[PDB]
Structure 1
């Protein structure tokens, strides 16, 4: 969207952001905080989470909490324990933004590494599901909870070389649709496709392209904001392109 919201759009909204230590997740966490949100940072790297929390505190005067979770390795019980810890400190979650993900191999199906394939599915699908499941009770405590998954163009139309990532993002669209159906009139559940954005992940899929022509995570934030604020309250079951 060319979306220009009020600077207090997310005042008194508690939003959890995964993959918050770098890339799009870091930018979304900072952006949400700049628009008034109380942000909860999830990531695998403690020192990077502490740094992001410190930066957000410098820009907002409000210090985010962070929690460690590695989606490659976490079990359901790890996710449940995390949700319990969040619930001690927070009365609800108004938003959950799933940004964490693994790209894996960009190469033909005949060459895909099966262990990498399994890991892409584990992070992007299984652990993303398990974390969602653990956080549903907190989301239901919101006046209008918003759950957002990260998708891709290759989650709508499979393309050569995109292997496990494409399969995982199709699965993500499917999971979003199941959830949107189950939580009609209860939650907003949608996907965002960030498109080609300048990130370390883009430096793997396209190791020979000029990153200078790619969009910055900051550039694609309008849609990230829109999905967490009140202007999207009447949208669920949909998948959006942050920049076609």
Structure 2
């Protein structure tokens, strides 16, 4: 998506980003900030969140708040305590970008490791679900709350060596549609499939690949920017692609 907006586009918007410590999440949080947003960072590692908060401070003069939450093991209650902690400092939430993710094994189903498989379901689906349940209220208390999940090409068509991850992204799509058709004109709820992007995790699943050939988290930010502003205030229940017509695979 080509999309060129005012650096005040998100001026009075409170937006929580998961997986904000790295890759696309770090990028999205920094970009939201740079466009006015009052961003909240979520991750497991505090030092990594300190780093990110500090850079947003350098870039914008306001320092974002971070909260720690480990999706692999957090409980429903853990998620409610979080929402409560948030609630004191913020009147509401205008946006939630679910970006935290676990890849897990890329390998044949025969070799796919079950603990890892389950770890992937837990982070990508279950905890992602529980956190969105704990955050649903704060969001509903927005002029027009925007909720986006992170999908993938193997969340629309499963390919040979993808495993827990393909299954988890399908579930993400499903989960988005149930929420979308359920919050009819109360919230926007969509997925973005970012596409192959230059991050450590794309490296890990494609070591052959030359990252210089890949597009960059900054390169795909337009879509992220769109789904969060007002230019999208009527669109819900959809799955947007960041690199339309890049098509599956490695070389590119």
TM range (shorter): over 0.9
Structure 1 length-normalised TM: 0.99
Within-5 A mapping of 1:1-244: 1-243=1-243
Task: Give CA deviations for 1:30-56 in whole Å, capped at 9, x if unaligned.
Answer: 000000000000000100101111111
Calculate the aligned-residue CA RMSD, in Å. Answer: 0.6
CA distance in 1, matches of 2:103, 2:86: 28
TM-superposed deviation, 1:97: 0.2
TM-superposed deviation, 1:210: 1.0
CA distance in 1, matches of 2:122, 2:180: 22
CA distance in 1, matches of 2:123, 2:81: 18
TM-superposed deviation, 1:7: 1.1
SS of 1:56's partner is helix
TM-superposed deviation, 1:134: 0.2
CA distance in 1, matches of 2:239, 2:146: 13
CA distance in 1, matches of 2:173, 2:211: 27
CA distance in 2, matches of 1:2, 1:185: 26
TM-superposed deviation, 1:203: 1.2
CA distance in 2, matches of 1:154, 1:134: 28
TM-superposed deviation, 1:221: 0.2
TM-superposed deviation, 1:135: 0.1
TM-superposed deviation, 1:229: 0.3
Structure 1 regions of 5+ residues with no counterpart?
A: none
Structure 2 length-normalised TM: 0.96
CA distance in 2, matches of 1:51, 1:199: 17
SS of 2:231's partner is helix
Identify which range, 69-78 or 207-216, moves more after superposition: 207-216
SS of 1:219's partner is helix
SS of 2:91's partner is coil
Structure richer in helix, relative to its length: 1
TM-superposed deviation, 1:5: 1.0
Misfit runs of 4+, over 4 Å:
none
SS of 1:230's partner is coil
CA distance in 1, matches of 2:236, 2:226: 13
TM-superposed deviation, 1:237: 0.3
TM-superposed deviation, 1:58: 1.1
Task: Give CA deviations for 1:13-68 in whole Å, capped at 9, x if unaligned.
Answer: 00000000111000000000000000000000100101111111111111100000
SS of 1:41's partner is strand
Identify which range, 54-63 or 176-185, moves more after superposition: 54-63
CA distance in 1, matches of 2:169, 2:233: 24
Figure out how many residues of one structure are paired with residues of the other and give that number. Answer: 243
TM-superposed deviation, 1:193: 0.3
CA distance in 2, matches of 1:63, 1:91: 18
CA distance in 2, matches of 1:80, 1:207: 39
